[PDB]
């Protein structure tokens, strides 16, 4: 175009937007992608703080492992000791001398944070609660939680007791991966618990019948309140909600289940030493993130600040396979010193580069080979010659770096 001056200089290249460093007033947090393990946001992620009921995640972790290993099943009926039934704090209200299934006890532990249920599972798997705590600390070392020490199975304060946001994210990621069925329990909205029979009722079964409960005692007054029901569906309301049976009704106190779209976990906790804490996970279009927030001064901030982290990660990041393993990258070998002029050099790594990167970076990433600057011929097949490098645009800034190995031979002159 001869009727415009300086169009090439007037044209505006798109400006790459880096994700801004998020700011919360939580003393510690971490946000991690599930499939890559990459950390996209964190503060003080290795500072040791009190665990509170996040301890119950490890207890639930060990319960799932014993089920997967065949030493336990969801159907197994555990006796409730008087020690378990009488533990204070959050209860699911299991009675001493009763038998309760693993499925019910795990639901009480995960959804209601019941200490009596946690203690009942611990006594059964470990014998004593002390022995079970030792198993918790061994399992923590095996997962790689190197800054974590539990004093008991339920997170009640007392004794040496700590974890980190990074360690809790490692535990959660392992939980999602190894125990997907047990992890589904954390998405339960609440627990409808028949304390008389010592068994639960599906929340869906409650919404069908809509029973009437005495406000002051939890005793069922009416089995069904629905105006029109089938005679046989009416009797199933009468069997699941008898007349006079005592019921306890509790919601899952992870508010994110109700407010955050795609949130399916995980666990809350609160002591004076730990503050309000939340391990949470949200999935949106195949992309799952894990967030841990520790030490907030209120439950509302605990939920507010966790949602900010999950929304920030889910909307600004992306999983990309930057390098497919065993992919050749060939270049001319003439420039490398002491090399014969005829030959070429191919390099490759047996590893992938699968990384969580900002969405805004993706169209600007470039594969590059950074050779050892002192590389001269001869070089043998299987010799390490440098790194495969992912850079951002035409700059030298590196997003990923992986050592690369020689697939050819070069002969010196
Ligand atoms: Cl993911």
From TrEMBL:
Pfam family, one: PBP5_C
GO BP annotations, alphabetical order: cell wall organization; peptidoglycan biosynthetic process; proteolysis; regulation of cell shape
EC class name: hydrolase
EC number: 3.4.16.4
Cited Gene3D superfamilies: D-Ala-D-Ala carboxypeptidase, C-terminal domain, DD-peptidase/beta-lactamase superfamily
Pathway: Cell wall biogenesis; peptidoglycan biosynthesis
InterPro entries tied to this protein: Beta-lactam/transpept-like, Peniciliin-bd_prot_C_sf, Peptidase_S11, Peptidase_S11_C, Peptidase_S11_C_sf, Peptidase_S11_N
Disulfide-bond pairs as recorded: 209-237
GO molecular function, one term: serine-type D-Ala-D-Ala carboxypeptidase activity
Residues involved in substrate binding: 267
Protein name from the UniProt record: serine-type D-Ala-D-Ala carboxypeptidase
């Amino acid at each position: 175009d001869p009727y415009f001056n300086g169009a090439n200089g007037l044209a505006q290249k798109d400006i790459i937007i880096r994700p801004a460093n998020i700011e919360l007033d939580a003393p510690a947090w971490v946000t991690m992608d599930y499939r890559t393990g990459d950390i996209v946001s964190e503060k003080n992620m290795d500072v040791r703080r009190a665990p509170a009921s996040l301890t119950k995640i490890m207890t639930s972790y060990i319960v799932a492992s014993e089920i997967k290993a065949g030493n336990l099943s969801w159907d197994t009926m555990i006796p409730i000791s008087e020690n378990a039934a009488s533990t204070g704090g959050s209860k699911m209200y299991v009675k001493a001398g009763a038998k309760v299934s693993v499925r019910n006890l795990v639901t009480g532990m995960d959804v209601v944070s019941g200490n009596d249920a946690t203690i009942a599972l611990a006594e059964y798997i470990g014998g004593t609660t002390q022995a079970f705590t030792d198993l918790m600390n061994q399992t923590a070392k095996a997962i790689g939680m190197n800054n974590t020490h539990f004093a008991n199975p339920d997170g009640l304060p007392g004794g040496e007791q700590y974890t980190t946001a990074h360690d809790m994210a490692l535990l959660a990621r392992s939980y999602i991966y190894n125990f997907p069925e047990a992890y589904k329990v954390y998405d339960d909205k609440g627990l409808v618990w028949n304390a008389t029979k010592q068994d639960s009722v599906s929340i869906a079964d409650r919404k069908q019948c809509l029973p009437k409960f005495d406000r002051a005692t939890g005793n069922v007054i009416e089995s069904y309140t629905v105006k029109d029901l089938d005679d046989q569906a009416k009797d199933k309301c009468n069997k699941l909600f008898p007349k006079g049976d005592n019921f306890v009704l509790q919601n899952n106190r992870n508010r994110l289940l109700f407010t955050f779209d795609g949130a399916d976990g995980m666990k809350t906790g609160h002591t004076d030493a730990a503050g309000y804490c939340l391990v949470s996970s949200a999935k949106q279009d195949g992309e799952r993130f894990i967030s841990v927030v520790l030490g907030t001064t209120s439950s509302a901030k605990r939920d507010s600040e966790s949602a900010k982290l999950l929304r920030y990660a889910l909307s600004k990041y992306e999983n990309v396979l930057l390098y497919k393993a065993n992919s050749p990258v060939t270049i001319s070998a003439d420039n490398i010193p002491n090399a014969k002029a005829g030959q070429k050099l191919t390099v490759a790594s047996n590893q992938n580069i699968y990384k969580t990167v900002p969405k805004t970076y993706v169209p600007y990433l470039k594969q590059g080979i950074e050779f050892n600057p002192n590389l001269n011929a001869p070089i043998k097949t299987g010799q390490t010659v440098g790194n495969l490098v992912i850079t951002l645009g035409d700059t030298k800034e590196e997003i990923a770096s992986i050592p690369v190995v020689a697939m050819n031979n070069v002969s010196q002159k």
